[PDB]
Structures are given as structure tokens and as C-alpha cells.
Amino acid sequence: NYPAEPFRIKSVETVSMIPRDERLKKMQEAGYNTFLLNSKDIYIDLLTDSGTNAMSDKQWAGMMMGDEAYAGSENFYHLERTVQELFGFKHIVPTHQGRGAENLLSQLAIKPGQYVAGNMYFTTTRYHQEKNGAVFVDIVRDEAHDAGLNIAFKGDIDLKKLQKLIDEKGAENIAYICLAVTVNLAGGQPVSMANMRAVRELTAAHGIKVFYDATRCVENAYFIKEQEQGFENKSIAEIVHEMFSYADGCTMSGKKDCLVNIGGFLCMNDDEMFSSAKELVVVYEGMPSYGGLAGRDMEAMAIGLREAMQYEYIEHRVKQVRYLGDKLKAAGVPIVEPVGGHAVFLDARRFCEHLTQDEFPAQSLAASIYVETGVRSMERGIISAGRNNVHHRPKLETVRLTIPRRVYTYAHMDVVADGIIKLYQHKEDIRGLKFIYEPKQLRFFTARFDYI
Amino acid sequence: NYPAEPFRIKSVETVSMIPRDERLKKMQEAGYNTFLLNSKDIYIDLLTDSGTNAMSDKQWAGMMMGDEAYAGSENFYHLERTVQELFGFKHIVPTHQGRGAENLLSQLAIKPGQYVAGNMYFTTTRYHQEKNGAVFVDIVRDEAHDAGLNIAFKGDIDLKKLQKLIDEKGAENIAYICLAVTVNLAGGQPVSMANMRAVRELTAAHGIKVFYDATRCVENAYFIKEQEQGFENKSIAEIVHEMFSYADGCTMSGKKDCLVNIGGFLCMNDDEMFSSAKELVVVYEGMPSYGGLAGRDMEAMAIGLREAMQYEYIEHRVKQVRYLGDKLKAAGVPIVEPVGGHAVFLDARRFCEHLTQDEFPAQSLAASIYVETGVRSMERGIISAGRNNVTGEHHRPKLETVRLTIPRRVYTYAHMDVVADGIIKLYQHKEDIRGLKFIYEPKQLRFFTARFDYI
Amino acid sequence: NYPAEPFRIKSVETVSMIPRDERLKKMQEAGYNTFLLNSKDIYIDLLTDSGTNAMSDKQWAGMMMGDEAYAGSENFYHLERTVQELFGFKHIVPTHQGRGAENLLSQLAIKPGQYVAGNMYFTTTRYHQEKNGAVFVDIVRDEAHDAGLNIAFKGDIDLKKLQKLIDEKGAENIAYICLAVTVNLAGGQPVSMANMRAVRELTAAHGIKVFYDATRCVENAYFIKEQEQGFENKSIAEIVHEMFSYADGCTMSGKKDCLVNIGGFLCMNDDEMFSSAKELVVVYEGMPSYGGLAGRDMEAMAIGLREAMQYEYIEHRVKQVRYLGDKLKAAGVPIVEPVGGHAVFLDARRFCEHLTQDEFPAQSLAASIYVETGVRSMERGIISAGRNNVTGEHHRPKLETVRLTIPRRVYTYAHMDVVADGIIKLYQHKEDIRGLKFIYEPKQLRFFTARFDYI
Amino acid sequence: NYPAEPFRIKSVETVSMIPRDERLKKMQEAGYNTFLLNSKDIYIDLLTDSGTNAMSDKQWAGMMMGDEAYAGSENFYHLERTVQELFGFKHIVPTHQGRGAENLLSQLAIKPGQYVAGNMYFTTTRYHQEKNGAVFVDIVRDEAHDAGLNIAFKGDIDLKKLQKLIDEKGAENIAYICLAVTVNLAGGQPVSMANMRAVRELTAAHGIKVFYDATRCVENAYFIKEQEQGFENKSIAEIVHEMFSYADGCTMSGKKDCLVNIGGFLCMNDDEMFSSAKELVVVYEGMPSYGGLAGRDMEAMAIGLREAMQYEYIEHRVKQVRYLGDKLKAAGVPIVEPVGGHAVFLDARRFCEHLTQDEFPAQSLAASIYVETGVRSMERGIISAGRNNVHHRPKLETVRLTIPRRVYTYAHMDVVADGIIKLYQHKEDIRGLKFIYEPKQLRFFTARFDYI
């Protein structure tokens, strides 16, 4: 039901084990904002799965083989051929991480006033689209916004919505479709191959380009192998390769499914766009031959992307997340369903119905969770959705327990679940928050609170 | 209760995950001898807790700071200060691992014909004692030889036996007392502080030296903290320091409780013996300032011994082993009791009570465990006992066991479940396990390269 | 005098050692464009001193201690304290390297139509200034444009030009002064402390901000210690701290003087600009607590910046480059003078005075150097200048040079001899060097992938 | 004439650069014994080439791939096949370093009262021979004991002496011939292939076994390629393999020519001796499958032994030593000739003729050299030769400047030479030593002196 880790522990990261009374003072020193906690005071850090992964012995051997040459590095060639083989795109440009690739794509592929349509959006991706003049259009199925609705492949694009956008706006005014795998904001929900194929067919008939946000494509491939009829006999690598065969290019944060702590890249099949991409990468990232990465990190990412294709690794990755979700759900703790590939999302408005929204139940729930167990989590609701000129009220008001790859055990998942549940058994005791410091911008990062 | 890992995974070691049918072929190519399996074919390797530990990020940082100088390495001085602080001995000599320290001690402290008495024995330790002319005497409590008896501090020396030896042989004819912590041969059983003090008191009244085999002294310290009344407010480091205050020196395999993959050392308080040890170490190991270790490894061992003093680390280490024993015992699987600090020992005589010992039930059980789970375990039964080469008969040990030896910080509870679930499943059909026979038996060291086939 | 390396080799990087005939084939397969050679085919790679440095054992120990947390990493706090101590700025934001910091600064500090004035320019720096609407003005001393003039502190800003700009355009229309240390385009020439103070004094009287391009500020500090009277009793760290006391902030490529393979940062004293920078860094680089770097790299950069303050290290760094220039100059080989902190620039116009600039003498000289020695160098001449795409004509730079760029702590004087001996041998038969012509020219970034063949 | 380093610097070992006045106090704190100096106070440490080498990036990648299994390690199999391929012996037993292999060989191959004959001897090797009851006989050519005599292949065995030993003692009373390559005590002097072939032919005709001390066999192979007629077209690896084809087994300290910081092994062709070796290694070293080494060190040594076969590496290794020797000899500094593979040996009785032997000119010369430059060196004369029951007066009274592999540059060699020469230009100023502390045993290690 829940497989054991398909690897051994090679080396350990020492943690402190400071007790509850001391954690309380550390939380109070952070003004009750988990973003202000220091890493040295954290037992289990579930802020994000981005860049927090444990590398393997083979990756660390590659780390000693960094060819740091400015051009012509063996590490660059290894990453290049690995991505060409596993993803099937003609051209690759490394970037220091995913939002560097998004910066390049959005400048290369958007004319001001055009539309970018996607299955929901991610913060940085949509910023770079809009900064370059695009209008974002959400074409995900309506169900993906219903947090409790347990349906498969919730990340799928609604073809009816895409058709409507083409009819109302015209194909020439659509810069591209942005298809993300998995869909982070919906809870890490996967996209079916049938949907990628149908989106490809409809866009190609109109000459519209498709670019993937590939950041968790291996988790997505696992959901396809597990749940999409006809893929039970296909390897993860076969599934990944077919996925990208329905795309014109992709942006990738290697910090996610390539099992590294830094790294990303931009892929594309078009030669002229590749030429333009090489001119632009020099401005922001570095020469096309390293893209703002040390040689040893191009090497680690090449090795990690291939490790991620191992069935047992990605099965265990996803089922470990699922174990945390299953234990919370069996206790009645309200969560986004179905559990996604990389995180369990608490529904904090359901958790703290005794507190009003304006008392910040997600922030105070995250604070309570650290004090009782030593775990940090992130905000994924109104605050992240931004404010609107004419707030950006989201249906998904979530607190994220984000699982780094290969870092934690099921016993760590139990510490997390036991603490969230023991809190949930006295849920009414948790206390609302009020600001005592709020900056104008990026407030989730440095704002400070106190109890009402 | 079983605590969560008081650490995170910093990096992982790749494993193959081959399925049962392919494990059966690897087991057959190994002649059904788990000692012959390739490491790359093993998912969970419980052959030994020696030298198989996972180091920390701080140790690996130390590995980048190896001062490889032949004499005067900063890493030696760090190892020296650390052992002087944590164990309290005056002098320390590094050795490449534990049996190199034993070689030195036995040459330094034994005159031929003298007796060495200990709480049971370990093979390398006793060999070096006997090779240098000592006669071994077991002075452990009789309870330690009852593998089913669930009692605390089973490793304790019987003071009456030690008193008896002093009276019959004479104090001047006893080279030293060899007190091991924990006691490996009894299943990893701890020694109480009460016992260490009484032994120190009795030997000191007669001028007799006491040297500890300190290889799992931190596991031992945890049992004292957990179970000896009056130690509940003492830190692991306090307990360790007090333990060694009752010895004249020690031999240590860092490969066990110092959380490293190689390394050991010899400690002593006597200045004259220290001079002689420095003269001998150059013969077998290296200079007194590196003792057959790279500078980076003295550094890793210095850091790891200090890491081992963290209460939550050693609590979890010992309770992870206990989890494995508890789950087996709850399904009725026969094991040595109580569970020791580092391993669970299956009682293969009872597990395979349809087989005779001449059909090698421990060897066969270990083969079955690997086939069913990808877990390697060690035969510790008639095969490892060897054959009497005077008579040609097997040595027939009372203990016919399979050792599930747990490396420190390498595995999780889910790995422990893989081990337990597969053993419990084997146990539910234990009568189906077949006997083995030799098809190749070397003259010596037969457990290492012997090959078998099913009867 | 040329000091010995004030370090030992801890580990080496394997190289192939292919002979001349096989180097000729690799050069031909690269289309005679050294930017196209494979790193594995190069013995001594002098393409750039950026990101190619050798780290120390202490830095590699830091690499094992990467706290990879998304926010609040211990490595960030270490980098923060270190830069606050050594540079003296109030606020620091990591960026993945120097041009990421430049992107942020130019967006934060420039209103469209304003002027940015500097001591010459660097390509990425000036691009981000112009992309955000600034007009660039060169206020370096006229001497810096005379490549043969052997004078000290050639990088100094002409205070009269800065005064002239303030009077003609108005102080409110100057976004900031961009003072680079050293000045790359003049050959790596240093700026005097006297000049930094005078610039600070003049700009402060008008409310004008000053930001340093601090990429080789430690090389710059060494020239001040060596050649500016009154600094002979000052430590490198004292000089560095005083330099930055005359700026409102800086952009830094750690890939140069912080002795790392990746990393950079943005510094400033202004609280309001710091808030805005924290809002912008999330757009392009990452959180203010990692800025597009792994935790291990913030750690390595923190350790390396502090290592760079050691006098003997930077003395040897700069004198190793000087050794290369001196040996070339003594054989009559034409170079930019005086030699800068990080590179020797061959004057390929004069070296190949039998070729026209349209025959690409720098590109060809660099191809010849690799064939004869296995040394890679960078074309910094008409090819890198690019083609005017409005008119189709080459951009024709006054400087037609080959850059021998020296990575820090990677090479020895014997490697410098390989470079010099081969160049001197080429020079003794310089008339034999052939012109090149395009056989493939990309529309943009032509120095990176253009291919050539001999005329 | 002197090639540049055939590698780049990947990482540096930080040193202090403390000046002369501070070095003087550190030397005085060491009682004027370089063995008592702390490594952190040393710029250039030339005490020994044993275990002090710089590893490569590929070796450090292998260090991250340590398979620490007690039996069946991939690292063991790699070392095993590498040694079988490069040395050609049937069986290999790892040991933690060379004297662990000597302990095994001497117990396996010596009956009490038998003779072991060799081309000179080394300290640990001869101790293990004699401890197991053998009588040592030196059968090196007489010239090898003449330090100033510049002749090629000074390490060669005198076949006339070997013949005499067989005739006087009888073949059955000779346990084995111990042939070392190079010969350390003679100054690192090489042995010719012609001599290894002739020793093999004579011993085999009498049934006498030959075991090599292989510790610097790659340096030896370089001397053969450079100087022995007919080997100029042979690769280093071809030469090494032919060398060991004239032996029944060998002891190897990997700490020397295998380019590692720890490690060694015992090789042999005989099956019964291998079986006996496996039983004995368990007592002293570890199981035959790791022999007292971590897996990662078996890996590093397998990689390093193959790196040592690169012609340009070993040419530069030897010529760097030769450069130091040439610069001293051009200044009139008296040295052992010809310069050997691993060290330059000062002749300190010729250097300090104004001081008597009993004033310890070698010790005080080593002290002076550290104070003026930051360099440590070792004693190789009477003190190392031991005392005799009925001193062991040696013709070779040498101070060794021992060069670790891949650690230092020619500029470091110049610091060393310039300091020894500037001393030699005022040689008469150096001051004799007297004991202020002398232990009974191992006195070179901890004894303390003062100036007369």
C-alpha cells in the first residue's frame, strides 16, 4: 500500500530536536510567520519542494566532476543530450532555475495585447507573461477550483474553453497555450495524456503554439502510469517522452522533478526562437553554454533527471505524499482532494471555522503546526493570489505541506500528521492573528503578527 | 513508543530494486551463501553494523578538511582532544580499526601463560589474547548464556567468578580483565554501571588491570540511561565518561559507535604502556599520529564520536532495532532476548525445527530472507563456527542464529517493515524451508566462500 | 620578483594532453573558433577568469554544509554577515551572478531618459542600464583609451568630465555614477582610492548616487596597496572596506574575486531601495534569502570572499598575471599596458600587422595559440564586436586583441611558461599567420558559434 | 627540459605563510625536531611522499561512490580487476597500507632460520622478515651504497651475490628474494628490466620465490622507459605489467605510487598461499573483501593506480624531483646521485663538515631549512638504520626532501632550493645540536634538542 524507500540513506542532515517550549519562543521571535523561521530551528521544513531535494551518491560524484569551462563543458553536453533524449526537444538553453526560463520564453513568444491561456497559472509564470503584455486566460476545467471534489486528472484543460477563446479572440491573438504538469495551484493535480493530445490537435489546427511548464512532469507521468487506461505497461520515461511530443517547447525548474537544489532550462523545437533565446540568455543568465549554472550543477541536474525516471523512486515519492494525506483524511482533517504529487494542502477555512478569514487562520494554523511538532508550511490562498486594482478572491484557500524529494521518512510524515490531527482534535483552541508589521509588498515573507 | 528519525536525509545511496525471480538467480549464483552476494544486488544490507554507517553533513565537511600530513595532522589533534574529553583516558593511539588496537593491547599487556578473563568474548579480541599466550576465562553471569531469558544488563560479569579466578590462579597471573560493552556474543547485551564499578573496585584491590572492548559503548550507555535507576538525569556523555573512569584503557572500533566507515583506536592511562604502544603501532598500523588512517578519517571519527553522544540519536538507533525485534516477537518469531543494541538474532534452530543443524538452518534461513525481501543477513551458526580440523567434525554452537545487524542512520522503519514482513511471512510457512548441503567447502574461513545447494 | 603559490594543491583536474597534430584537428572541427572547442580538448583554458576559479578545502567543506532551505538558510546569514563586515553595506541581496544584480540595480535606480556615467563600461552592465532607459556617458580619463600608455590607476574617472556632465545635463537627470573596479575594457586597470573619494565628494554635494561594479575589487585593492602612497601599512580588507565606504551600493560577480564558480550579489545602504530590491529579486532570481543560488554556493562565496582578503593570495594572483605579461613584453610581443589584474591582452593588430582587420587577426591568432600550445584564449576584437545590422558593416573596434584570462588558483608559472613560450614562438614567425574568413556567420552572438576557414 | 604540470589545480589546501621570526619560535617549540612540527605551521611538508598525494577529480568522484558493504563491494571488485589487469597477478588481498601486506607475506612465506635477500631493505619490510625468524642478506650491487656515484639502475641486484647466497646457504633455506622498485634507502634508485629478468631466471632454476616491494613501481617504470635501451616505445603500463611478470607476488603501499592517502595490498599467484592469506588478513586487517579500507578508499586506489600509468603524469612527477636536484647540484649542494624518483637526499655530512656527526648535522640542517623557508624534511641515516647489539653505521647518511605527488609546483621547488642554497652559501654558520630529551625507542619521533 505504501512502499518503503527505494534507496538507502547515504548521509544525514543534522537537526536540533529542540522541544516545544523552545519552539514556541522561536515562533514568537518570528512574529508567528513560518517564513521568518530559521532553518537551524526546524526539524521538518515543508515550506516547499523547490530546491530542497536530497541528491544521490551518483549526483554527488558528478558534483566532484564539475567542468567549469565557460563554453564547451562536458557537463553542458551531458545535460543537453540527456534532455534531448528524455524530453525529445531539439534545443535546450540552461537557466539558473525555472523563472529564468519563463523570463526568456515570455519575452520571445508574447506580443503585447496577445492572450496566454493555461490550466490555472503559477505566480512567476503569469508575472512574466503579463509583464510582457499578455492577458492571462484560465482554461482549466471548472472542477479544478473545487478543492474537495475528488476527481482524476483535475489539471486537465477544458477544450470547450480553449475553443471559445479561439473563436472570440482569434488564433493570431493567442501568443500560446501554457500547459503545466502537474498543476501546482490546484493541489499538484495531474494532466492526462488524452488531454495533452487533444490540446495539441486543436492548437495545431489553428497554428497556435503550446509550451509546457514542465516543473513536476515526472510526478505527472506517475499519475498517468497509475490511473490512465492503457499506460499501465509503459515506463515512466516512455510516458514523459510522449507527453512532451505534444508541446512546442517547455520551461523547467530542475529544482523540482530533476532532484537538484538549483537549476532549470528552456527547451524548444524552433530554430529561430532558439537563436533569439541564445541572444537573450546572455543578458539575464549567462552564456548559452552554462545559463547561470556552475558546471557541476548542470551535471547534477542531468543525472537527477534520469534518476527521476526510475519507477520505484517516483511511485514512492507520490505515495509518501499520499500517506500523509490519507492519515489526515482518516482523522477528518479537511484537505484538498485528491492528494497531489508533491504536497498535501490543508483547507484552513474548514479547519478553523471558529476564526474569520480576516484573522488569518492559515497563518496561525501554520504557526501552531510548527510549535507542536517542528514543521514549517506555506500559504497558498488569497495572499499568494494577489490583490486586484478594480482582493483576488480564490476558491482554493490552502495551506501547503510541501514534501522535498528523498529527504523525509514515513515516521516524519507521522510527526506531521499526528501534530496536525492533535491540533484538529482541539481545533477550536487555535487563536487568530493580527498584524504588528506589514510591508507594502511581498508581505507573506517578512510580515509579523500577534495573537488576538 | 518508537521515535521518528532525529535527522533528515541529506543524500541517498542508489539501489537496484531487482524483483524476487532475479533475486533467486543472484542467490543461486552466490551458492545460497549470503556472504557471496554482490552489494549492488542487495536492497537492505544487514550483514553487519560495522563500517556501514551513514555519516552526517558535518562529518563529510570534515572529510574535505583532511590534513594528510604524516605527523602532526590537525585531524589527529582533534581526534585526540575529543577522545580525551569524552572517554577521559590520558593517552590515545589511532588504529585503522578495532582489531588493530586489540593486536597492540594484547602484545603490550600479556605475558605468556597469564589469564585474560572477560564477559564472554569476541573472535578477533580473543584471538589476539590467545596468540600472545593468554588463557581465556569466561566470567560473564550464567544468565547471559540463556538466550531466551529476558533480563536487564545481561552482559554483567559475575563478581564471584572473578573472585574465584583471582583465588585459584593468583592476581599476578591475570594479565587483565577484558570487559566488553555491549556484549556481542550474547546478542548485544549491556553492562550496568554498578557492575563496572564493582569490577573496578575488586581488580584495583589486587593490582589487576581492566581494559574495555568499547566498540558499542554508546549503545551500552543508552541502556544505562534507560534502565539503570539513578541515571535518568545523566547525559549520554556523562554516562560514557563515568563508564571509562572504571578502566585502565580501551580498544575501540570506530566502525561501530563512532558512526564511521573505518577507524579505531587504543586508549590507556599508563605512561610507560603508552611509550611501548607508540613503539608498536609503527610496526603494524602507522605513526602514533595517524595509526593507519587517512587524516580525513581521524576527522570523521572525531566528529562522529561526538555526534554519538546526542541522546535522541542513540535513543532512536536502539529503538529502531527494538522495533524490529518487537514486531517479530509479536508474530511469534523466535529471537534472542532481550533485543540488543545493534542487531536482532533469529533463533534458526527453533525457526527451522524440522531441520537438523547438519542441514544448516541458519544458512538456509538467511538465503530465504534475501530471496523473499532483498535483505542480506549474516549466518551466525554452525557454518561460521567452522570445522574441527583435528577431527573433521563441525563445531556445533548452541546458538544457531541469523543476525539482522542494523547499520546506524542508514535505514528507516519502513525498511524494518520490509525485513519483518518477509520474515513473518516465511515463518507462517516455515516447514517449507529446505535444508542445505555443501557443494564447495574451503579448508578455512568457510563462512566467507562456501557454496551450498538444497538437499 | 614573482612569489611562489601561497597554497598547496589539494586536488587536481584531469586533462587530456593531446599533441599538436590532434589539436589541429580539434581546431578545424571547431571552425577555428576557440569558443567552439570542447573543454575536454583543452590543456590550459584562459577563455575567462569568470567562474573558473579553484576553491579551497575550506570552501569544499562549506559545500558539504549546504542548508538548502528556501528561506532562512544558515548559508545566507553567513554570506550576509560576511559582506556586511568586509564591504560595509547595510543590505545585501544574493543573485545567481553579476548580471542578475545589474538587472535589479538598473530597474531600481534608473528613470527613462536619465544618464548613467561610468569609467568606460562592461557589456552586460551597460545593456541593463540602456534597456531601462539610461543614456551611457564615458567619464574615464582620456589616458585609459591609449592602450600603450604605461601609467598607474588608468581606470580613474576624470573629475572634470563628471563635473561637465552635471553642469550640462543637471544633477537630477543623472541616475547614478557607475564606478567599476578594476576596469575590464581598459585591460583590467585599477582605480585609486584618491579617485573614489573625489567622486564620492562631488556626487554627494549634488545628491547623486554612486554604485560600484565591484567584480574585481580585490585585484583593485591590491594595486592600491602596491602603488598608492600611504596604503603600504593597510591590509587588503582595510582597503576594500574603505573603497566601498565611498559608494551607495554595488553589484558583484562572485565568479571573479570571490573565488567561486557561480554566485553574485547586490548591496545597498538605502532602506527603501532594499525593500524594492527584495520585491524585484523574486521576479528574476529567487527569494531574498537565496537569490538563485544553492545554499552551498552562498556558503562557498562567503568563505571565498574572506579568503580573497589574504594579502599573499592576491599578491600572487596579480603577480602571476604580471609574470605572463612581463615575459611577453621582454620578447617584444605587443600587449595592452600596463598589465591588468586578471588577464594579458595581446595586441593582435600589431602582432599580425600583415593582416587587415577584415581578415580577423585576433580570431586567427587565438586559433594558432591553441594549435601550438593547447591554450584557449578569447577573441576580443572585430568578431566579438559584431556586425551593424542596420548597415551590414562590421563594428570595427580600436582594440583588436586576444585575451589571456587567468582563472584564480588554477594554473602555475610553468603553465604561464607554456602560454608565453608558444606565443613568443608564434611571434618569431608572425608573418606566417594566415587570415580567416567566415564560412558560417549567425545573425547574432556571432563570436559564440561563427565558423571560419583560412584565406 | 622540465615539463609543466600535466593537470590543472582543482582545489587548494590553504596554508598560513607565517614569516621567518614566527617559524623560528615554532621550530623552538618543536625542540628543533621537524617531526614535532605541526602541519598547520608548514608551508611545504617534505617529510614523506607516503599518503600525502593530491587526488584527482575522478578519484574524489569515486570517493562519493563508496560502497561500504562488508563483503561484495563494487569498490573491492573494481580494485581487484584493476590490479589483476595492470600487475597481472592472479589474487589480490587489500590491506590498510603496505606494512599490513608485509606482515601477511612475512608470516606466510618465512620459516624460522631461513634467509630473505634483497636489494637493500626498508625499515618495516625487514622488521616483519626478522620478526618472523628470517636472516636478512643484502644482495644489492656495492655501488648502490656509494651516494655520490652517478650510475644508472643503482637499485639492481648483484647476481653474483645472489648466486653466492644460493651456493653457501642452499636454495631450500632461502625463504624468498625481496626485490624493491624503486630502492628507497639508496635514494629512490630504479631497477632495470634486464635485472628483474635475470633475477627471475636464476631464482626459478632453484625453486626460489620472488616477491616485489611494489611501492614505487611506477616511478621505476618511468626510469626504464627513459633509460633502458629498447623500452622507449613501450607504454608505462606495458612496462609495469612486464615488471611484475618476473615476480611471484608483491606488497604494495598504495600511499605511494597509487596516488592515494591510505591503502595497500598483497598480491600473489599461488592458490594455497592466497587461502592462507585470507585467513590471516581477518586477524590483523579486516575481511578479504576490504582489508581494513573503507570502500571509497579501495575505489580511490583503483582509480589512482590507473591514473599513475599516464606517461605525462609520471614524467612530470620524476622531472619535478629532478629539477630540485639539478638546482641544488648546480649550486654545489652535495646530494645523493643520481636523483631518484620521489625525493632528493641531501648528504648532510658533506654539507656540514664543520660539525661532527655526534652534533647531529642532519637534524640541525632539517631545522635550519624549515626556519628559512617553511619546509620540513626527514632523517635517513644512522638513526633510521638502528643500533646493533654487538650503531648500525650506514654509508648513506642522508636527509630526505620527499616530494608528495601532485601537491607542489616548481615555484615551491625553488623556495626549497633557494633556502637550502642560501644556507649552503653560509653553511659554516649552522649550529650543532644536543639532546635535551631522548626516549629509549623511536627517538627520531619525539626527541627534543637544543643548540650547542
Ligand SMILES: CC1=C(O)/C(=C\N=C(/Cc2ccccc2)C(=O)O)C(COP(=O)(O)O)=CN1
Ligand atoms: C509550477 C511552477 C512552480 O512550482 C515553480 C516554482 N515553485 C515554487 C517556488 C516558489 C516560487 C514563487 C513563490 C513561492 C515559491 C513552489 O514552491 O511551488 C516555478 C518557478 O520555478 P523556479 O522556482 O525554479 O523559478 C514555475 N512553475
Ligand SMILES: CC1=C(O)/C(=C\N=C(/Cc2ccccc2)C(=O)O)C(COP(=O)(O)O)=CN1
Ligand atoms: C619502500 C617501502 C616504503 O617506502 C614504505 C613506506 N615508506 C615510508 C613511510 C615510512 C615508514 C616507516 C618509517 C618512516 C616512513 C616513507 O616515508 O618512505 C613501505 C611501507 O608502507 P606503508 O607505509 O604503506 O606501510 C614499504 N616499502
Ligand SMILES: Cc1ncc(COP(=O)(O)O)c(/C=N/[C@@H](Cc2ccccc2)C(=O)O)c1O
Ligand atoms: C565486540 C567487538 N569487538 C571487536 C570488534 C573488532 O573491531 P574491528 O576490527 O572490526 O573494527 C568487533 C567488530 N565486529 C564486526 C566485524 C566482524 C568481525 C569478524 C567477522 C565478521 C564481522 C561484527 O560484529 O560484524 C566487535 O563487535
Ligand SMILES: Cc1ncc(COP(=O)(O)O)c(/C=N/[C@@H](Cc2ccccc2)C(=O)O)c1O
Ligand atoms: C566588469 C564586469 N562587470 C560585470 C560582469 C558580469 O558578471 P557576471 O554576470 O558574469 O557574473 C563581468 C563579468 N565578465 C566575464 C563574463 C563574460 C560576459 C560576457 C561575455 C563574455 C564573458 C568576462 O569578463 O569574461 C565583468 O567583468
Ligand SMILES: [K+]
Ligand atoms: K536550494
Ligand SMILES: [K+]
Ligand atoms: K566500510
Ligand SMILES: [K+]
Ligand atoms: K563556472
Ligand SMILES: [K+]
Ligand atoms: K595520509
